[PDB]
Write a sequence for this structure.
């Protein structure tokens, strides 16, 4: 036939394909979510998340050295609480689990980039991301508490305060609180566009989130692309240093759209449900885990993500699959 | 706190959330892929795709009636061949499996829109998508055969000829071929952006594709977003009635970029691999299948797809989960 | 002939057309304007609006249950006043018609989305949308009163306070008033771009608006597309949760232009004159009412409207034409 | 209140509003559709279109003179045939009704710009816009006939050949045809975006279109905005001198999107249905006809139309409402 | 001070800076230019390009093995001719220097991607890029010869034919030529935007280009940014597989503008002059060579280049500075 | 061959090329960086910068007259300090070197445009661009001092205060300080996008900057194009009269991108390392200095720069190469 344009020409050998590959993925693009449980002794496997385990607080100094030695540059701290209550106040206790997780990480590996998850769903008896009032989760009462938690996490050494409470004005609240306390240099990794997804089941199992209803009244609608952009642009306006799309996997259209609407760095969270789905199809022998993980993380980068929160990070690190 | 902008205002209730939902998913958005195996008697279960079975040719009249009864408006045919050879010539035999799958569907259900997968990987002894040469899969030898297959399938009643060979100029070749033989009205549903993905394992099992190596010399690189758009715009230029992104789940950024680059309809294939990861994670009790399937399909719609190829379409239709 | 591109290919059967339909319309997209008259006993037909009737206040609890049972998710309340005066002060009487209409609706169907029309043209002896002063309608005196009305409507349970007075700064005024009174969660459905149209005659008949001149000094010029966009973008800037184009029917260019200029939800009002025109041509046997209604509402959605205010809503609901 | 931006500032008076009016409507924006019935003696009233009458061929010289005297710069001819058949061949008879309507207009008023409707629904026994086949309306059989009709109408003096058959490739066919016969200077006014609307009932009555079914296999879907633009850009590509959206009243979003996609002139047809809804609502005394006609026509201008096809053009011209 | 936005927040440490680095440079981004001199025995040092030497043809098998061992994925061949003449015919001799440089590279290292410089300035007695006429370099006489050279080099194994003659229509000429001779799969790497720069002195020394005058009648003006884009888009239109900007260092604005105007791969040539200025400044001890080379190459990547032609590639590869 | 488009047509003679040259460079586009050393007697050559010399303060009145007489319209003052200390306080001494350099220039040539470099790296014992604190360079303590320096430089007659400290909020700080002191007319030439480049070695030698580490914690990452734009747009937002990209040479993609994102004038700094690289390759006889300088400065203008800071300026001036 007569065809002048032939895409296949640059696909002929592995060398040609390597030369013309548009997107690349490094170990640097990954942030490792870590689960830390206070007052316990043995690491606990998370069933819903094949390979993940809660790290006993007594072993955190050891795991963070392990992670750092594998080449992971950053972690996101999630605690499993034994001092839950109606407001999740242990989260702003200058010495509670949240402060302690940071303290230990920064003390152990000074150069480790410590992002402290900032919410209450893991510290409240009801499992909601804030103060429950007659109304539902109280936005402004929760903003107050998110700010106090911010200051003690910054106090403990957290490099980024990451609000995941899906509260309006949360970035502004945390920025003023940090500044007022002399933490004007502490960064905010906002979970800016965070969907009321059905892919967090494994995570809730892993983190001990005691919730029976849903978070549909704060986390946003999965179907709303316009609203998703506006959620992130409001956070940019309130001073976030980095934005984020959560989940990442089934939202790369949102990542790409946001990429074109801001100059800010954009993070993407490869959530627990996405991890479970790769892990369980691999164990059923349906897919090649490694090929599927690399393709998935590669797609997230291709969509425009600057950083990817991924539970596969340390394995990828240690098995020298990514450098 | 001071906030005039409060996104949560429209999230207060189920009624408010429904009123402001930006994207909708319905049954007419779905196209159901079916596997038909010739010269066989019982339905065969696909191991890697729980719930999916090869339909015996003898029972296709029965199944396409069932499918149609469920509300499914369309199907994509894939045959499992017992007449494979060097060039996959059974596919262009006037009464080969390709032509008969269409014939039995259109004759049983005249209203059923039948899209006929158009390739050779299911009919070649080597498992590759075309004619082999010392070269690798020979582009132009394959184009002639795609043309021949197009006319017999068109003659057999197929409403869409869907070339999935990833051959340069395939749409033009098939357009020229159908036109000359008097099928100027038969449409082309081009797998215009078809990535050399690792998510097709389950499908190859289901369709009996005898491939030992890879398809990287013709299916495109997963990392190449600019190339992906160019791939589809070259097919729009060639006359394609509908364009397509495959896989869809991890390529929503592609679907969205493409939506902004053409006025043509865009299909998105929720591949066997995606189906597999959802089913095994649900079997493992880690996620809720239905909520995860609906979220997954809704995101593909959200990203810009007009039609979605889903192996979940029949259950969603019969269980009246989508109307 | 030789034509590669053939649009007609996807128009061959009802099935194909259904698969390729770009826009859809659900019962969810509709908001039902309701006319409630205090101190009366029998429902009154509105002559200019064939099929519409004023609901006696004593029957409102009954009609709102009827509407809600038909599946309508939201209503817009308009009262016919028997206590008109120079400033329309019954509108901010904590117990006047406006408060009462809301009170009754929310008390009867707690989940009903109650949008309270916010103006004075129905409560003033002169029929103008505010305070008449030497000058004409006094913008700032009217802003004051619009805020007080907002608080009592929010107090009564209105979900959205909908200013239709076409007063500059009305959204800002209503937002500060609501916030100050502890109604920071009450939404604003601004009639942001509201034209000085000649299509409201039937509505004025239906609502008892006692006006002899025009509203050309506040409602904007029908011919000004640039000004129309700016009117809506100013409201976005002042905190509106939802914007609106009124009328909708002969302004879909304005709807589409606004759609591309904001991420906010956009409402469109299918006004009384548009309803009368469909109703009277149908009664003269000139057109098919149902086909024309569905095509018109479908066009409004196609233009970019997220919600449509429509008097045909309950019929469409009950006759199961829309679900 | 504090507001530096007050849109009402330029709305204070009639002089200020006129000075800032963005869009203008004049008589030269209007094209007058006329119905001419052959072999008949008295004017026939169109029931569904009050004020509209079939003009007897014998009286056309008289009427086109009247029209021209009124200031009308152009007309679109529609003939009511007494010579219908299977293929609508009277339309391409050198002296058939199509050719004579043009001839009598150009010869009576040499300056009159005559646009000749170019189709077969008014000349076929079955009422469809072309040649029927087992298929439905045969596209390419019809294109040949459109070509033949184009040359006789061109030869008869028509200034524009306006194909309203909704056939793929109609503009190219008619361009090729006129060119070969030496009418390289005759223009094409393409009904480029012609929707399968329900607003044409009154017109079919007025023009005697013997159709029992629908035109959905060729006129396009009302819901398809992206397809609508593609429809017109394919005609610009084919050489069309002017493009068009029909209907116009409920498709102003289309007109505006198209205005932004081409530098070509764009016509908009205010259809019989729109005319009917305005007239019957005015008869019912529900709206003011003149104010509603002027607003309706002004919105079509506002949306981007260069020319408007209106059945109100003559009254507006004679009553000196437009100059 | 009051500042919510503090860019320095993500600059606090080496880890934070790496995590937020937007652009990456790797070894696969580099293509290594090599100078091969025929009929000679020892390596010759290039004075003006410290570190660069003419490789004796006899030692090419050895060197391409060394290059390939280092990790270099590709080279661009430039031969120093001992058979120059009026038309540069040695270049299209089936076994001329051009064909043999390719042959020895592909045969020694089958995986090596060989791009063959395609011109006549190194083979013509007058030193100009083609056939001379009273005119100056004759465009179309040269195109024929570029075509002839393309096929022998293609036949010899070259993976890319890279026309650097700056002839109008060179890509089409070479595409037509390779196609006819059965090299439809051989690619074209067009020096699409090739400026008449003053930075090529060192290269001419290294490649033995016998030119006394200038190339301004064919290489384009350095000041013309709009012309530069037009130059490359005409080559994309002609079928070029990859486009290119030369020089690259002082034309990063061009590279970036071009990146936004095409989806095609874009190469950028870090010319001999740039290489020379870096080396001599480093020799003079004024700058750090490595830091300056890495910054220079990283900026070309940053600006949008997919591939970079660099004379520093081998040292960077062997010293393991890039992987 | 057949080619309609022939770029070469406008390249045939020097006259044609001159007519079609898109970009031009005048002496007006250049700003001359001057090095002034207090308490010394003989001009000192800067080894790293062939041709540049520190001007003894006692000779400044003489050199500025020389510069002005050559036609240079503006200079950028850099001092070599003999009164360095921990905070660089001599920089805000109403009579220190910074004040004095300006004083002398404006006193000598009243019409000379005096841009005073505003930092501390030349006045601090540690060589950092501000106040060193436990943390690193203290952003806010440095902002304080940058403001005081601004007022005394404005006091001395500087026309532009040019902050090069890469401190967040520096433009805002300097603007408030200037305004408060009655210097609301003094302009700010912000070094808005200033990279942590490896091309400043020669400058540091020339300016006596006593730094042993790097400026990576304030000057921005060379690889971050998105951040580069945001750095400049923040300065526009804080009131800068002119923006700047530094370095210029290997950042013309950044210059072009910024050009398209602001209406503000954009300056570009052809840094010392770029000067050294041209000078040393010219001395090694590798390139033609003049041709390379003119091409480089011409590229900077082509990329979008309105003013270029260049050390070659006075030579270009005196040798009448630029007027
Ligand atoms: C937000 C969502 C948590 C929840 O709603 O339970 C913060 C945690 C994100 C990670 C969830 C996951 O990895 O599934
Ligand atoms: C604004 C216009 C009312 C008026 O000017 O009388 C608020 C009511 C909109 C609906 C009017 C209608 O449906 O005609
Ligand atoms: C900023 C950079 C100076 C440094 O970091 O030493 C202000 C001076 C710019 C000119 C530097 C040069 O010309 O190299
Ligand atoms: C594409 C090629 C599939 C393959 O096996 O390479 C055409 C069929 C797409 C379906 C694949 C799937 O569902 O996994
Ligand atoms: C389009 C087809 C009309 C039809 O009856 O299908 C060409 C004529 C447009 C005028 C229709 C009207 O005015 O209603
Ligand atoms: C372009 C022409 C070079 C010339 O000498 O005119 C093709 C080769 C580019 C390399 C030039 C260099 O590296 O300086
Ligand atoms: Mg938010
Ligand atoms: Mg293709
Ligand atoms: Mg307003
Ligand atoms: Mg058409
Ligand atoms: Mg060229
Ligand atoms: Mg800055
Ligand atoms: Zn939470
Ligand atoms: Zn295949
Ligand atoms: Zn009102
Ligand atoms: Zn017709
Ligand atoms: Zn050359
Ligand atoms: Zn400094």
């Amino acid at each position: 036939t007569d065809l002048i344009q032939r895409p296949r020409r640059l696909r002929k050998s592995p060398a040609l394909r390597a030369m013309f590959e548009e997107t690349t993925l490094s170990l640097n693009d990954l942030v490792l979510p870590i689960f830390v449980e206070e007052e316990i002794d043995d690491y606990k496997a998370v069933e819903a998340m094949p390979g993940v385990m809660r790290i006993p607080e007594k072993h955190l100094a050891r795991e963070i050295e392990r992670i750092a030695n594998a080449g992971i540059r950053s972690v996101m701290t999630f605690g499993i609480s034994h001092h839950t209550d109606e407001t999740g106040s242990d989260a702003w206790r200058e010495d509670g689990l949240v402060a302690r997780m940071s303290r230990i990480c920064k003390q152990t590996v000074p150069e480790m980039i410590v992002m402290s998850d900032t919410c209450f769903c893991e510290y409240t008896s009801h499992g909601h991301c804030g103060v429950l009032c007659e109304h539902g989760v109280d936005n402004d009462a929760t903003l107050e508490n998110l700010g106090k938690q911010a200051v003690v996490a910054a106090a403990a050494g957290a490099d980024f305060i990451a609000p995941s409470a899906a509260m309006d004005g949360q970035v502004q609240a945390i920025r003023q609180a940090l500044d007022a306390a002399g933490f004007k240099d502490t960064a905010i990794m906002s979970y800016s566009t965070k969907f009321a997804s059905s892919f967090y089941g494994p995570f809730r199992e892993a983190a001990g989130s005691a919730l029976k209803g849903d978070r549909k009244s704060y986390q946003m609608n999965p179907m709303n692309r316009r609203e998703a952009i506006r959620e992130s642009l409001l956070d940019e306006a309130q001073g976030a240093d980095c934005l984020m799309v959560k989940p990442a996997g089934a939202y790369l259209d949102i990542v790409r759209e946001l990429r074109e609407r801001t100059e800010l760095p954009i993070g993407a969270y490869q959530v627990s449900g996405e991890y479970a789905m790769i892990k369980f199809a691999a164990l059923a022998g349906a897919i090649d885990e490694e090929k599927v993980v690399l393709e998935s993380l590669g797609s997230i980068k291709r969509a425009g993500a600057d950083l990817i929160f991924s539970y596969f990070a340390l394995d990828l690190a240690e098995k020298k699959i990514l450098r």
The radius of gyration of chain E is 20 Å. Chain E touches chain B at residues 184-185, 263-264 (CB under 8 Å). The domain at 1-323 of chain E is CATH 3.20.20.70 (TIM Barrel). Residues 139-155 of chain E form the longest helix (17 residues).
